[PDB]
Amino acid sequence: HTLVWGVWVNGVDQGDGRNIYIRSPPNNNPVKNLTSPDMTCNVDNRVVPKSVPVNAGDTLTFEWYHNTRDDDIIASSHHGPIAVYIAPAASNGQGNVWVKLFEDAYNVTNSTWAVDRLITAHGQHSVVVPHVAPGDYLFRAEIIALHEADSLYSQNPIRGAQFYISCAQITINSSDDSTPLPAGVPFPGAYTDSTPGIQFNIYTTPATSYVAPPPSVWSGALGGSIAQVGDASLE
Numbered sequence: 025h026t027l028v029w030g031v032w033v034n035g036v037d038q039g040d041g042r043n044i045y046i047r048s049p050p051n052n053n054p055v056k057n058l059t060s061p062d063m064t065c066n067v068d069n070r071v072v073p074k075s076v077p078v079n080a081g082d083t084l085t086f087e088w089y090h091n092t093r094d095d096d097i098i099a100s101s102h103h104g105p106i107a108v109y110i111a112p113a114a115s116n117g118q119g120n121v122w123v124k125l126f127e128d129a130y131n132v133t134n135s136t137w138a139v140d141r142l143i144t145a146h147g148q149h150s151v152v153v154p155h156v157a158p159g160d161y162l163f164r165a166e167i168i169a170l171h172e173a174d175s176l177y178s179q180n181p182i183r184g185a186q187f188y189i190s191c192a193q194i195t196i197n198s199s200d201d202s203t204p205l206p207a208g209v210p211f212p213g214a215y216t217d218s219t220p221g222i223q224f225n226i227y228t229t230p231a232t233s234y235v236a237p238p239p240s241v242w243s244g245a246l247g248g249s250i251a252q253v254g255d256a257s258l259e
């Protein structure tokens with residue numbers, strides 16, 4: 025159970041984005057139905073009034089929280105991967121439009137899942153803004169908690185992988201468009217019951233064997249990290 029509070033750009037807090045530039049749902053409940061329109065941008069997918077300006081090569085940081093800002097972020101039980109996708113705003117997230125900018129599942133050296141390192145990072149994980157066409161975009165941050173993913177929701181609706189999905193409205197101003205955005209995958213649609221990383225038993229299968237759901241990270245992606253960029257308490 026987790027939500028996005030707001031974003032930072034180049035280590036500068038953009039301020040509380042809830043229902044302002046984040047398409048916030050009303051609470052931190054997971055999405056579990058892989059075929060639901062709720063997979064796109066969670067259960068209250070509508071245009072919110074603001075879009076955060078960035079430039080190509082900027083660091084865009086999502087900040088998650090559980091109940092209050094900079095709390096325990098997400099229950100430690102919720103081990104799983106983190107991904108970030110981008111789509112043009114004119115798509116409204118429909119069609120084959122979502123391009124993966126970031127994937128992190130399990131760090132074998134540190135013996136930590138992405139979620140574990142997200143807690144340590146005070147909810148903060150980043151992407152570098154790619155050299156796509158200037159214009160308006162949706163950035164879709166997705167946490168998959170695997171604590172009940174030994175079952176499929178489609179078969180047992182009280183279990184399943186849990187998706188914590190947040191869409192940010194981002195405007196890219198300065199970009200040379202050297203890497204025009206390619207085709208992407210659909211949400212819902214990209215994840216099915218047979219997709220690698222949707223059904224997994226974290227209790228008995230070594231985390232080193234986990235494969236996150238495709239698609240792969242786009243070669244135009246400029247990178248990203250799970251790491252604290254800013255101290256929310258200094259405000």
Ligand SMILES: Oc1cc(O)c2c(c1)O[C@@]1(c3ccc(O)c(O)c3)OC3=C(C4=C([C@H](c5c(O)cc(O)c6c5O[C@H](c5ccc(O)c(O)c5)[C@H](O)C6)[C@@H](O)[C@@H](c5ccc(O)c(O)c5)O4)[C@@H](O)C3)[C@@H]2[C@H]1O
Nearest residue numbers: 071072073074075112113114115116117160161193194195
């Ligand atoms: O007079 C305006 C001008 C606006 O730009 C807006 C206006 C009013 O109202 C809003 C709005 C107002 C009050 C609200 O409570 C609210 O929830 C939304 O709704 C809508 C807006 C909006 C629409 C859409 C839009 C889409 O068609 C599809 C989308 O997926 C999105 C959209 O806007 C969003 C947007 C929001 C604020 C921006 O500055 C911005 O550049 C883009 C975001 O990009 C997501 C665009 O027309 C987009 C826009 C207008 C002029 C531009 O020069 C431009 O680059 C982009 O603005 C609408 O679908 C809804 C925003 C947005 O501020």
Ligand SMILES: Oc1cc(O)c2c(c1)O[C@@]1(c3ccc(O)c(O)c3)Oc3cc(O)c4c(c3[C@@H]2[C@H]1O)O[C@H](c1ccc(O)c(O)c1)[C@H](O)[C@H]4c1c(O)cc(O)c2c1O[C@H](c1ccc(O)c(O)c1)[C@H](O)C2
Nearest residue numbers: 100101102103170171172173174175183225226227228229
């Ligand atoms: O009635 C229950 C139901 C529980 O799920 C638990 C229960 C009691 O006891 C606990 C427990 C309770 C109080 C404690 O103070 C405590 O230290 C542990 O011990 C254990 C010990 C275990 O070996 C395992 C526990 C638990 C938890 C866990 O909460 O729960 C896992 C689990 C939890 C939720 C699920 O939906 C699920 O399908 C499976 C597993 O049954 C089991 C386990 C394994 O079989 C193998 C493991 O490698 C692990 C395990 O849990 C550990 C665990 C430890 C603490 C938790 O809160 C928790 O959710 C899970 C850890 O995740 C690693």
Ligand SMILES: *[C@@H]1O[C@H](CO)[C@@H](O)[C@H](O)[C@H]1NC(C)=O
Nearest residue numbers: 057058059060061177178181
């Ligand atoms: C899953 O979502 C699809 C598409 O909206 C819907 O038809 C189906 O009823 C949902 N399943 C459950 C159990 O609500």
Ligand SMILES: [Cl-]
Nearest residue numbers: 038039040041
């Ligand atoms: Cl603020």
Ligand SMILES: [Cl-]
Nearest residue numbers: 144145251252
């Ligand atoms: Cl950190």
Ligand SMILES: [Cl-]
Nearest residue numbers: 080155199200
């Ligand atoms: Cl550029």
Ligand SMILES: [Cl-]
Nearest residue numbers: 150151248249
């Ligand atoms: Cl980064």
Ligand SMILES: [Cu+2]
Nearest residue numbers: 025026099102
């Ligand atoms: Cu939860």
